[PDB]
Symmetry: C2
Subunit: 330 residues, 2 copies
């Protein structure tokens, strides 16, 4: 028995969420469906144009850790906030879900990261993120005992944007593998993959990452191809296990020459896609650390992802364990 | 023409919202369906026990002003926040709705008011409010030109808790009535009525308040009676116009010997009752300042209230003007 099933590591962010029309994205030169990095001045400008909003704790890996805990797994999280009200919100929400979260703020400035997320009528989400205190996450924030005692340590490709987070991740990889654990990453966003393609492939090929999460766009971006079959063949050669999501078309899990396709749940209405990939990773990694088949891990991922897109906000407000039991995935 | 249809005045609050079981309220000695005032220490304690939450700008009168603006009316708001992140959220959300909001923060301490609102399975809401910077609202915050230029000035009974807000209200009443405008209040909460019964009746009987909003519980509390018919007869005698809501049983508008009964709208589900009364006041006052019949004012109020209870959070995220046009109230 170990202390943790899943440790996740990412940019600690509070989401500021509002609905907009498609013209808003065009007028403001916001790339639809993507993570758009912004500076403090641009954050002020976009906020001044944003309608009334709702706030909810976010951060891709934060959401994944919360989802693991929700399902009943034992989760931990590394991510840096500031000693401010937004940081206090973030700290409360993740700890209240039962995730181990002990990363200490380094003062009030830079302030806690926030992402202005604009949800269009089709339920797509377009994020505009000021990293703030996330730039301070570094090797000093690695709780070595936690990495050692976690079955899987999972991190965001998004961590390659701040300056020193990658150093923490390399430390995690060393500790995890020295203690016989596994490392996992998400490719996070197609433009993120554009930025760090070579680095990501090296993480996989050197064996620093064992399990990779991608959506279709990310997989295509990783190999700069329009051929999805090529992307699947290549990603399977580059990592031990790959979990590739395809929105309404479900998911495919690859291991060597093995492929396991999983159907997406049929949806009432797509309210807000924010968190879909994050919660797919929650379901998959919960199943994986419970010793479930790759197909069942995919099923658990699709169930969690389907639930989160039927609500506003990135962390399911309902019980995923109850949902999983009803679905016979238990 | 005037600059404003409705000026509202209230405790400026950010809501922190979570779902709980009925046992949680009992274990924590939270009075169900009520506004429970709390100190800083109790706020810390309750927060430590609360699950993951979402944040949304609140404040009863704030919500009412936002609803008037949503419907297409011209609204203003007086309420005091701190110079902190929660205050910045509050300031953003109300201004983004098109409400004039110019009250200046006085410092960072006390911090911006917040209310932990626990929603039970029946959709009832139980609020736990630390007033924070609201204790600083006073006569200095009265923008006399705004009061002079507003058709109706509406305020919360809740303002009788902080120490100096009542002085601002008395100043508002004077300026309003000297400029031929009307004053309105809501009784806010049955325990609030218990605390300030005599003062509230004095506001009405002296004519400082022209239009009074109450729910059934508040009306009964005002006259310490179990007889709803008595309460209606007495409230009609004590104020020029009374609007009394009765939840699923709609509302009754009273003027002198006149009575206008209005039905509740048909609804999908009671998700969260937070804001119901606030938005009834939005609909009513919007109608009133557009020169509509008292019955139509009631119908607009019931429409807005019915909309808000079908969503999480206190301010409608959909267009009230569009809904009013579709319902044929225009
Ligand atoms: N640069 C980023 N790094 C990590 N997570 C992010 C970033 N920008 C937005 N997010 C998060 O992505 C989540 C949706 O997957 C949101 O909850 C949001 O907080
Ligand atoms: N003491 C108070 N004064 C004014 N508004 C309040 C108080 N406590 C809670 N509220 C607000 O009541 C609203 C619902 O009517 C919520 O949005 C919440 O912010």
């Amino acid at each position: 028995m170990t202390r943790f099933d899943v440790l996740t590591v990412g940019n600690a962010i509070v989401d500021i969420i509002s609905r907009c029309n498609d013209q808003f994205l065009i007028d403001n030169q916001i790339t639809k469906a993507a993570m758009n990095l912004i500076d403090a001045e641009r954050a002020e400008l976009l906020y001044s144009r944003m309608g009334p909003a709702l706030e909810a704790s976010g951060g891709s890996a934060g959401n994944t850790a919360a989802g693991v805990a929700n399902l009943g797994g034992k989760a931990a999280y590394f991510g840096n906030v500031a000693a401010d009200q937004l940081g206090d919100i973030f700290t409360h929400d993740i700890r209240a879900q039962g995730v181990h979260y002990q990363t200490k703020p380094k003062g009030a400035f830079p302030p806690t990261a926030r992402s202005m997320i604009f949800v269009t009528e089709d339920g797509e989400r377009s994020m505009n993120t000021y990293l703030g205190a996330c730039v301070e996450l570094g090797p000093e924030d690695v709780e070595a005992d936690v990495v050692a005692d976690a079955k899987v340590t999972y991190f965001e490709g998004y961590l390659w944007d701040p300056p020193r987070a990658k150093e923490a991740i390399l430390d995690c990889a060393r500790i995890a593998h020295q203690h016989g654990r596994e490392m996992s990453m998400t490719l996070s966003d197609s433009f993120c993959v554009d930025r760090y393609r070579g680095e990501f492939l090296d993480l996989m090929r050197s064996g620093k990452v064992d399990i990779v999460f991608a959506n279709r766009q990310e997989a295509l971006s990783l190999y700069q191809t329009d051929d999805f079959e090529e992307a699947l063949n290549r990603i399977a050669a580059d990592c031990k296990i790959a979990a590739v999501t395809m929105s309404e078309n479900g998911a495919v899990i690859l291991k060597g020459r093995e492929r396991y396709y999983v159907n997406a749940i049929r949806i009432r209405e797509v309210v807000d896609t924010t968190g879909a990939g994050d919660l797919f990773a929650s379901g998959f990694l919960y199943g994986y650390t419970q010793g479930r088949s790759l197909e069942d891990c995919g099923k658990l991922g699709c169930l969690a992802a389907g639930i989160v897109i039927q609500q506003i906000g990135p962390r399911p407000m309902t019980s995923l364990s109850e949902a999983a039991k009803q679905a016979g995935l238990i």
